[PDB]
Design an enzyme around this catalytic site. Structure first.
Site, PDB file in Angstrom:
ATOM      1  N   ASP A  78       0.856  -1.177   0.000  1.00 56.16           N
ATOM      2  CA  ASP A  78       0.000   0.000   0.000  1.00 56.16           C
ATOM      3  C   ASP A  78       0.896   1.232   0.000  1.00 56.16           C
ATOM      4  O   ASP A  78       2.089   1.143   0.289  1.00 56.16           O
ATOM      5  CB  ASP A  78      -0.944  -0.032   1.206  1.00 56.16           C
ATOM      6  CG  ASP A  78      -2.232   0.736   0.970  1.00 56.16           C
ATOM      7  OD1 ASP A  78      -2.348   1.392  -0.086  1.00 56.16           O
ATOM      8  OD2 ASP A  78      -3.124   0.683   1.843  1.00 56.16           O
ATOM      9  N   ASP A  79       0.363   2.400  -0.317  1.00 57.55           N
ATOM     10  CA  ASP A  79       1.203   3.591  -0.372  1.00 57.55           C
ATOM     11  C   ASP A  79       1.554   4.127   1.011  1.00 57.55           C
ATOM     12  O   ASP A  79       2.688   4.539   1.253  1.00 57.55           O
ATOM     13  CB  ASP A  79       0.551   4.688  -1.222  1.00 57.55           C
ATOM     14  CG  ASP A  79      -0.820   5.093  -0.725  1.00 57.55           C
ATOM     15  OD1 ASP A  79      -1.520   4.236  -0.148  1.00 57.55           O
ATOM     16  OD2 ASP A  79      -1.197   6.269  -0.917  1.00 57.55           O
ATOM     17  N   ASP A 117      -2.071   5.460   7.745  1.00 59.76           N
ATOM     18  CA  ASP A 117      -2.404   6.637   8.537  1.00 59.76           C
ATOM     19  C   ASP A 117      -2.804   6.247   9.956  1.00 59.76           C
ATOM     20  O   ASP A 117      -2.025   6.405  10.898  1.00 59.76           O
ATOM     21  CB  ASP A 117      -3.533   7.416   7.855  1.00 59.76           C
ATOM     22  CG  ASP A 117      -3.773   8.774   8.484  1.00 59.76           C
ATOM     23  OD1 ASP A 117      -3.845   8.868   9.729  1.00 59.76           O
ATOM     24  OD2 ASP A 117      -3.898   9.760   7.733  1.00 59.76           O
TER      25      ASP A 117
HETATM   26  O1  LIG Z   1      -4.530   4.209   7.468  1.00 60.83           O
HETATM   27  P1  LIG Z   1      -5.924   4.505   7.063  1.00 60.83           P
HETATM   28  O2  LIG Z   1      -6.516   5.640   7.814  1.00 60.83           O
HETATM   29  O3  LIG Z   1      -6.786   3.300   7.065  1.00 60.83           O
HETATM   30  O4  LIG Z   1      -5.861   4.990   5.534  1.00 60.83           O
HETATM   31  C1  LIG Z   1      -4.788   4.619   4.631  1.00 60.83           C
HETATM   32  C2  LIG Z   1      -5.310   4.057   3.310  1.00 60.83           C
HETATM   33  C3  LIG Z   1      -6.358   4.891   2.656  1.00 60.83           C
HETATM   34  C4  LIG Z   1      -5.834   5.669   1.513  1.00 60.83           C
HETATM   35  O5  LIG Z   1      -6.650   5.108   0.380  1.00 60.83           O
HETATM   36  P2  LIG Z   1      -8.172   5.440   0.232  1.00 60.83           P
HETATM   37  O6  LIG Z   1      -8.401   6.722   0.973  1.00 60.83           O
HETATM   38  O7  LIG Z   1      -8.902   4.306   0.880  1.00 60.83           O
HETATM   39  O8  LIG Z   1      -8.340   5.538  -1.276  1.00 60.83           O
HETATM   40  P3  LIG Z   1      -7.718   4.823  -2.464  1.00 60.83           P
HETATM   41  O9  LIG Z   1      -8.566   3.692  -2.950  1.00 60.83           O
HETATM   42  O10 LIG Z   1      -7.493   5.756  -3.609  1.00 60.83           O
HETATM   43  O11 LIG Z   1      -6.428   4.270  -2.122  1.00 60.83           O
HETATM   44  C5  LIG Z   1      -4.366   5.237   1.385  1.00 60.83           C
HETATM   45  O12 LIG Z   1      -3.945   5.112   0.030  1.00 60.83           O
HETATM   46  C6  LIG Z   1      -4.289   3.896   2.173  1.00 60.83           C
HETATM   47  O13 LIG Z   1      -4.624   2.737   1.426  1.00 60.83           O
HETATM   48  O1  LIG Z   2      -3.412  10.944   0.012  1.00 57.98           O
HETATM   49  C1  LIG Z   2      -3.536  10.614   1.200  1.00 57.98           C
HETATM   50  N1  LIG Z   2      -2.682  11.170   2.164  1.00 57.98           N
HETATM   51  C2  LIG Z   2      -2.712  10.959   3.533  1.00 57.98           C
HETATM   52  O2  LIG Z   2      -1.930  11.547   4.281  1.00 57.98           O
HETATM   53  C3  LIG Z   2      -3.744  10.036   3.865  1.00 57.98           C
HETATM   54  N2  LIG Z   2      -4.163   9.588   5.101  1.00 57.98           N
HETATM   55  C4  LIG Z   2      -5.203   8.839   4.854  1.00 57.98           C
HETATM   56  N3  LIG Z   2      -5.502   8.748   3.526  1.00 57.98           N
HETATM   57  C5  LIG Z   2      -4.556   9.515   2.888  1.00 57.98           C
HETATM   58  N4  LIG Z   2      -4.516   9.735   1.561  1.00 57.98           N
HETATM   59 MG   LIG Z   3      -5.893   3.059  -0.294  1.00 59.84          MG
END
Ligand SMILES: O=P(O)(O)OC[C@H]1C[C@H](OP(=O)(O)OP(=O)(O)O)[C@H](O)[C@@H]1O
Ligand SMILES: O=c1[nH]c(=O)c2nc[nH]c2[nH]1
Ligand SMILES: [Mg+2]
Ligand SMILES: O=P(O)(O)OC[C@H]1C[C@H](OP(=O)(O)OP(=O)(O)O)[C@H](O)[C@@H]1O
Ligand SMILES: O=c1[nH]c(=O)c2nc[nH]c2[nH]1
Ligand SMILES: [Mg+2]
Lengths: 145, 150, 145, 150
Positions: free
Chosen positions: D86-87, D90
């Site tokens: 995952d990227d 948080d």
């Molecule tokens: O630690 P958390 O508070 O759970 O959030 C972290 C997640 C959510 C956010 O993606 P999303 O906001 O879910 O959207 P996307 O599908 O574009 O990744 C990010 O890329 C991580 O996968």
């Molecule tokens: O682009 C993002 N940046 C953040 O810092 C983050 N935290 C939750 N979801 C996130 N998405």
């Molecule tokens: Mg995500």
């Protein structure tokens, strides 16, 4: 000759293609062709707001044989199949066969494989090698002197 | 109709141009046309290894169908043995004035539209008259909303 | 190690520095130190709307020599260089332009005190790799798999 | 407080992560968490020479103080011999959910905030809790007005 593609330019092309796929509501999901279609697929998913992103993995083995390592379910109805480019369309034929109802698109397209895609953004000469962002990096380059 | 120019691409064009300007021993120095030719001039200086970089500052304000030019700062000389660099040439208005001030100079640019094309000694990229060139120093990496709010 | 600085990042730091030099009416012009301060000086000139940009070319042979210098004591001018390591070149600039506001983008501990303002702190043993010394080229995969 | 992440920087971090995942022969494939882990996953796949790249799509929906999770699509198995990427992490909400779906998988991210830092097997950059990470796919190079109008 070699065609250098930076991340910024690739993203500019991805957004151009995303606008032609509007409205996003008509699409159930995106199927990215590994590995070339992964990044372009991710950009379209972000722009179109599509969260159902799947993949299709294929490898090669006198003749060349296509091997499906991983496959996405269905015939592609309501799906967008994306790859980074189409050169000869050798891999494009296999994808069309698996997902006939899918809307196959790419960023780049050379003359030979151009008829095999439903849409693309940039025309590239058959003899030009497209150097993608993932294959490059920012490193030191000696002065011409 | 817009032509986006990132830093990476500008550098690639600048290096192309630098390879033509070889050897670097024939050049006394570089005269950058402020402000557009500053970055390209700095890039040529790095590639050619020229430490002597000077500038020529000319401001221009259009008044309906005529231009008010003003030389704020001028580099001394007739451009003999110097490279006069600017980022681009559109109508050629600036180019004509520069050739005047520095007649014996090798005037070059990165981009060149059809009108100013005959005024430059050398350039790298051809750009249409109707096309607006968006330079890197006028842009920035910022948040861009999705095509769809899905 | 080596601190990698891309064009985008260098521009961000330059904009942060530009906002501190406001308003721009208090400045008569900008004197860029060749060749490191050329790009940062060009960015400041754009952000602050300053069209009067001059240069000062210093050379080594430690014996400093000025190839070309902007006339004046630097009253109302902004003298800029890309960085300040030990302050060797900085001390020479101070002597030439006393009333000038000397600024840089990066600053190491030893040369920090020699500048009126800077943006990023860099360790003394860290080599700053500037954007003009790099380029996007092919980089082989970490594995030949 | 926001942390700008350009494409070049993300790639540098991805390459550093790929070095620790060596050798690549120990991995059967990569499972990217859509959509954030898609680009980082693609970079690892290129660096490690991995071709088997799959995805896990999880849709989140904040309803005041509670979250509603819905799995749109998921890769088969328990992640044995796979790399789940995952990227960023948080709060660690998604991480916990993923770890439950793939308990035998090596879970990694590029960025990690204090709260979710103990949930990842490996990460590259430490980010403060109060800092918002601005990813490249959400940005773009566009015109930016000068800080002054002189
Ligand atoms: O630690 P958390 O508070 O759970 O959030 C972290 C997640 C959510 C956010 O993606 P999303 O906001 O879910 O959207 P996307 O599908 O574009 O990744 C990010 O890329 C991580 O996968
Ligand atoms: O682009 C993002 N940046 C953040 O810092 C983050 N935290 C939750 N979801 C996130 N998405
Ligand atoms: Mg995500
Ligand atoms: O071919 P012409 O029609 O004469 O214009 C081309 C000029 C003008 C423009 O700079 P300016 O618009 O003058 O602004 P700046 O000082 O920032 O370069 C550009 O960078 C070239 O130097
Ligand atoms: O940034 C610029 N781009 C152009 O295309 C141009 N033509 C004149 N002046 C210009 N400035
Ligand atoms: Mg100009």
């Amino acid at each position: 000759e070699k065609y250098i593609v930076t991340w910024d330019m690739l993203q500019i092309h991805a957004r151009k293609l995303a606008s032609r796929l509007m409205p996003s509501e008509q699409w159930k999901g995106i199927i990215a062709v590994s590995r070339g279609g992964l990044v372009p697929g991710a950009l379209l998913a972000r722009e179109l707001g599509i969260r159902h992103v799947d993949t299709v993995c294929i490898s090669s083995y006198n003749q060349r044989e296509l091997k499906v390592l991983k496959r996405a379910e269905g015939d592609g109805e309501g799906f967008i199949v994306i790859d980074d480019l189409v050169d000869t369309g050798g891999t494009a034929v296999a994808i069309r066969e698996m997902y006939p109802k899918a809307h196959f698109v790419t960023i780049f397209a050379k003359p030979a494989g151009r008829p095999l895609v439903d849409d693309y953004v940039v025309d590239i000469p058959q003899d030009t090698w497209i150097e993608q962002p993932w294959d490059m990096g920012v490193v030191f380059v000696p002065p011409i002197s």
